[PDB]
Design a protein around this ligand. Structure first.
Ligand code: NA
Lengths: 155, 149, 163, 164, 162
């Protein structure tokens, strides 16, 4: 054997094919399929509907699924609605509503702008929804999918 | 860091080739299919309609009638237990500017919702002008056992 | 490099339907795919071809997409209309007695105007038909369309169908 | 060790390993398969677009071949939506020169009480397999409507994957 | 007991630079635990404050990434008429060949010059090799390219953990 393989083997820890049966799943407590395990429930759902304020979705470590819509405005509009992740020093917008660019009119129709995110927060991070104006709203739901170590949280 | 102790109440430097016989000893997309019999179809106008109120996982997909965020017309998917209600899909999202002629679009939702004892998944419209439309089916029981289409 | 007793009835039952455990972790490389002649991957299995594609563009009639047992993928668009319109464009499943709408076009709720813009209403479904079932596309009016494509993905039994 | 009684398993093993006992000692393994093959081992990485593999297209008032050799293709993008009554056509189609099937159609909107007809993108996202003589194409019959997108070959006609 | 096996031979030589067993071995797999956990696609691909390449491009060309590896990039462009002079798009380039991967000039209004605009979404997995650049570009103050990206894997295909 001459190989990267020794390297992966190193980090992580023949000519007869061996027939095996994998019992990880049952030893793990049974199978939990991704779509079911990520299900929203009444108790686990972080519902939000933010207009003219800043509202925390999550501020403790872990992985979060967050889906929803923002009120679209002209890209030059003064009315903003976003999902952003921040630590108070650096802030990054993960979903932006000022995206549309009408031509030849000041009558500007608006549509929802969908977002569907998986965000991982570590210590000191905050995932928040923000709207700076009563006319625009960040609406959606979120839930914790897993703890910061990656251990899955049952729905 | 031995998870070997939990599942099963040194390391070799020789890689052994294997073949897995587990499967031999249902695909997700097929398992979750809609049929005439399992489909919970709904088209909700000026009323509140229960999609499901018995424990289990449900898949629910469809559209709401968009309205101005300032509108009084409500069309939503929501989960309640009669004490706490949380909205899972909201129609009052649009923000037109420089006009009172407010075009509307469908607002799509595609959700997996688990209900436990006493939970209700429901579609609600408070006005004849806005709709909650879509379909649902039960994907699994409350214990996570899959249901065949 | 010696073993250890284990106490599980969940593992034990599962091994009968399909004790102790060694303390030397073996590196392996799975050869099951090659051994089988290559494995199928979902996204390729479900591919559309010129032969298998059921294309439809439906206007002011009712058109069968499929009416024989099996699992069907069906994707496309409907012409959106005001929720109050009489103009209907839908994907439905029926058995001649009960009919259920799987995609619905009468959804928009314009306000303060009667000039009603329209957009495509996307659908993307997996539908299993059993004996007697029909999947159809229906437009009741020349102004509205049901457009899209579909193909049989697997038989009523579940056996995947090569593209 | 013990003996197994199952014909299905003996048959699976017969075909998988061409030319029966069980064990009661669970062996903890680690899997190095993805590393021994190396890179783009997960579906999403293997299907990546690159500057070299990307078939970019932006079609206006002409027919443009996206692919015409056997293989599985991923093709994603948008059409200019027009009124369902329009004569302006922007589609993705597949053909053998005899039969032609549209896989993404742009003539879908149904405005009411106006002739000022707003237009939006109509997204498509397809997996298409072509055999000998099949052509995958984008077609616009008018300079006012576009078929835009990207495609790439995901696999040869036999299902063997192509690295990005 | 052993038995001789006579594709698999080619695979073994390729994979690890011939016989079978009759005793079926029960086993547990700890690779994900050994890899450090959260290797499930959705978790591993998560955006974080540190890894997120956020961009909001207007009237300028902005690099999203220009070093080898696989990137996920998602976002929106400001739609314009297909004949519009205002472009915002996401494209990969080598400084010789450039290809647009998301294009905003898609709408075709009829019977009006009052042209409404919507977000044009993109969701891409892009692999850059040496000399490749992925960038967002807008030629006009009126149109944006917005969204986020991160590196999912190195060019060799090793996953990067969030
Ligand atoms: Na308000």
């Amino acid at each position: 054997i001459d190989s990267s393989i020794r390297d992966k083997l190193n980090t992580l820890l023949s000519t007869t094919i061996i027939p095996v049966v994998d019992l990880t799943e049952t030893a793990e407590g049974g199978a939990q399929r991704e779509d079911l395990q990520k299900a929203f429930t009444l108790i686990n759902t972080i519902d939000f509907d933010v207009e003219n304020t800043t509202t925390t979705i999550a501020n403790t470590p872990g992985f979060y699924k967050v889906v929803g819509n923002l009120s679209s405005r002209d890209e030059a509009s003064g009315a903003i609605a976003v999902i952003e992740v921040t630590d108070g020093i650096t802030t990054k917008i993960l979903a932006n509503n000022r995206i549309v660019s009408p031509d030849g009119t000041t009558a500007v129709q608006s549509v929802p702008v969908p977002f569907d995110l998986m965000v991982k927060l570590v210590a000191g991070d905050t995932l928040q929804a923000r709207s700076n104006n009563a006319e625009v709203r960040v609406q959606g739901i979120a839930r914790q999918i897993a703890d910061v170590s990656g251990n899955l949280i049952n729905p």
